[PDB]
């Protein structure tokens, strides 16, 4: 149900976090800086805005 | 209504605190300091988004590093997940 400079995060069904329709896990997902904090993305860590 | 939701929510908050805290290298260097973190968790306790919203910059910093690592327990209730998909938390070592 949200989006970052790298995209939109949606809560699926069966309750998985998805991004680009991808159910991001602890394995294709990392925590990347965002202003004063962090936010989770997947395989697009270098994707300029 | 909010019957018994309040207690679980306070409880769950304190459980997030202790999971973040368990991942500190030197949690006693920050003993009296306070940090406010705004957290977004998935339906199963997985970290989604974390940002600080007040308090000590040094503590806020270490507490974000520890938040990257913590294993946060699964919300035990619809009401609790309703709160912790987005919610601010006072973190105090």
């Amino acid at each position: 149900s949200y989006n970052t400079p790298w995209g939109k995060v949606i809560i699926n069904a069966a309750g998985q976090p998805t991004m680009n329709g991808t159910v991001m896990t602890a394995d294709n997902s990392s925590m990347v800086p965002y202003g004063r904090g962090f936010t989770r993305v997947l395989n697009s860590l270098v994707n300029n805005p | 209504n909010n019957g018994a939701s309040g207690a679980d929510i306070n409880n769950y908050a304190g459980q997030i605190k202790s999971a973040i805290e368990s991942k500190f290298y030197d949690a006693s260097s920050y003993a009296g300091k306070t940090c406010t973190l705004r957290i977004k968790l998935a339906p199963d306790g997985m970290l989604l988004d974390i940002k600080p919203e007040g308090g000590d910059p040094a503590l806020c910093q270490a507490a974000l590093a520890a938040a990257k690592l913590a294993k946060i327990p699964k919300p035990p209730s619809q009401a609790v997940y309703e709160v912790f998909k987005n919610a601010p938390l006072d973190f105090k070592p």
Side-chain angles (χ1 to χ4, degrees), chain B residues 26-48:
Chain B
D26 62 309
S28 11
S29 303
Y30 303 95
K33 306 189 184 195
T34 310
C35 177
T36 303
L37 287 95
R38 182 139 206 117
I39 51 110
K40 299 187 177 187
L41 313 179
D44 72 332
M46 198 206 185
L47 226 195
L48 282 185

Side-chain angles (χ1 to χ4, degrees), chain B residues 4-63:
Chain B
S5 50
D8 287 327
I9 291 164
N10 242 244
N11 222 258
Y12 185 68
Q15 228 70 246
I16 305 173
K17 294 177 206 200
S18 97
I20 300 247
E21 219 206 283
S22 102
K23 248 93 178 158
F24 272 65
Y25 300 103
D26 62 309
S28 11
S29 303
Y30 303 95
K33 306 189 184 195
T34 310
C35 177
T36 303
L37 287 95
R38 182 139 206 117
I39 51 110
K40 299 187 177 187
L41 313 179
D44 72 332
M46 198 206 185
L47 226 195
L48 282 185
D49 188 282
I50 193 100
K51 200 174 215 144
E53 289 216 338
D56 190 70
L59 175 55
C60 284
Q61 184 183 113

Side-chain angles (χ1 to χ4, degrees), chain A residues 23-47:
Chain A
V23 14
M24 48 180 181
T25 28
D27 307 7
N28 52 260
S29 208
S30 56
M31 223 79 190
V32 145
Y34 183 26
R36 295 164 301 101
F38 298 100
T39 199
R40 170 168 237 101
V41 34
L42 30 62
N43 299 300
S44 341
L45 301 21
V46 60
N47 229 65

